[PDB]
Symmetry: C2
Subunit: 293 residues, 2 copies
DNA sequence: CGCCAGGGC
DNA sequence: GCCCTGGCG
């Protein structure tokens, strides 16, 4: 047998051993699609195309594996001795009567995985976009003044702490629902000047756009989605717009002299990130460039 | 042979047909447990107990029914002609292999319903608590003010005129990071203070303190306060909240309204009686308030 | 401690 | 258009 509690604990063991991390999957997909071979202008000019292709292919490289995983987990429930000499129809009926909780719990675990993974994959996709564009960023998940809702800080947290002038903060939510309300909260709490909110959401309202606007949160989506749903609306930006802004601001940072301590802190920031991303050559390379400059 | 989209359509049709609404279930449970006969002092004094008993009993009814529903939905995909000559073991194995999107879509639909229902039911339980306590409230789902405010004491008309001596209540069964929505709404509309009712046992001192600076006060059961937040004068119990509501409500007891405000209030109440037309206890609560405008 | 490949109400 | 009987990462 296997109690629902015991099944839940098992579900977790297997998921870990069977699935590579969201960042690992994104990185694999980045390299498989040959994005590690494109120059910086590709990322600057085609971020929507890149995001859409990444999303497409990450899902392709996940979905068949989630399907197999589910079937494996359910196999632990099948009880040969209980069902032996049952009619095949009665065996399935029994299974749908005896285990609809275990079954529900497996699927619940899967959706919860999917939600967390979708967000982390989306953030990873955007992170590699900035790295491919050659734009200096600290990844908050790789190292108050900055809430955890902010994923990317350009050009880094040390510089931002020094002065928020000429910096860019980016948050991401795949869909918004009412969860966009979290963002103005973080903006107001820490005195953030403005924040970019990257999304794939095709359904948010003019009311939402305006409330975010008043709060100095700028919604950024793919050019496809803007043109299809928000074409006229100058308060909705595209990734193309955001990348051009990021690039412009970044240039203000490519010839700066730092104090002993500041340079020390920045080095320590980048060091932390080389450590986190040790196993990913393209990313370690990105940071190394920043460190020797 | 049901396609995944067809199965989704059936699941939605069947769910609508067979499950009563969150409020209807709460109202049934309220009456089944005898709360519809308790005086206001009962609710004033025993809110935490009432809330937990309501939650337990709502779930006791719902969960067996949902289990039976799930089994019934799944039986629409059993294919006799397909499975005729397989062993029972191979039959199940095949089932686990042929319908993964179907089974997942059903469970997904179930948890999404559970999430939506859990919030609506908690809100309904708190609504009936205030009604039982005899405290005047407008229910935002029944008639500026953020859409996450559930109850407005004594009413939206009065609140709009002047928020002095009013009370606003929001509710979230669990907080996660979603508590961040509350300061956003407080700050957007200039809310003086908001009570945030929750059953969550796990929120941090940092969250408490950020909410505190935002003039949002977390309200939870006695049990949760004493187990996890015993020392902490920033975390209130439902008992504390009800005492505050009752004290503020007395300021609204014999208020003389202009004819204009009186007719707007009347409109707001009459609107809510419409929403709750099917629920005698709630209609009677509102008609007492309507009657008070002519007293 | 944040995410929401998120449908339900 | 807000809910999260919500676990995963």
């Amino acid at each position: 047998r296997l109690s629902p509690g015991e099944f839940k604990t098992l579900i977790s063991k297997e998921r870990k051993s069977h699935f590579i991390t969201p960042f690992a999957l994104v990185y694999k997909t980045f390299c498989d699609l040959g994005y590690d071979q494109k120059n910086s202008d590709y990322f600057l000019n085609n971020p929507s195309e890149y995001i859409i292709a990444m999303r497409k292919n990450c899902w392709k490289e996940f979905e068949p594996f989630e399907k197999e995983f589910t079937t494996r987990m359910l196999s632990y429930l099948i009880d040969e001795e209980r069902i032996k000499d049952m009619s095949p129809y009665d065996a399935i009926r029994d299974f749908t009567m005896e285990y609809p909780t275990h079954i529900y719990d497996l699927a619940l675990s899967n959706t919860q995985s999917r939600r967390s993974r979708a967000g982390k994959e989306f953030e990873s996709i955007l992170e590699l976009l900035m790295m491919g564009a050659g734009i200096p960023v600290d990844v908050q998940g790789a190292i108050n003044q900055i809430g955890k809702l902010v994923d990317l800080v350009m050009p880094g947290v040390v510089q931002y702490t020094s002065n928020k002038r000429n910096t860019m903060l980016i948050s991401a939510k795949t869909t918004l629902r009412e969860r966009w309300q979290e963002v103005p909260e973080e903006v107001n709490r820490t005195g953030i000047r403005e924040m970019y909110l990257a999304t794939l959401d095709d359904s948010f309202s003019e009311e939402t756009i305006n409330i975010l606007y008043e709060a100095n949160v700028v919604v950024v989506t793919t050019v496809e989605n803007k043109n299809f749903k928000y074409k006229n609306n100058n308060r909705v930006l595209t990734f193309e717009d955001m990348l051009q802004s990021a690039m412009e601001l970044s240039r203000k940072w490519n010839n700066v002299s730092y104090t002993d301590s500041e340079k020390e802190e920045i080095q320590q920031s980048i060091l932390k990130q080389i450590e986190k991303y040790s196993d990913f050559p393209y990313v370690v390379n990105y940071y190394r460039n920043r460190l020797s400059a």
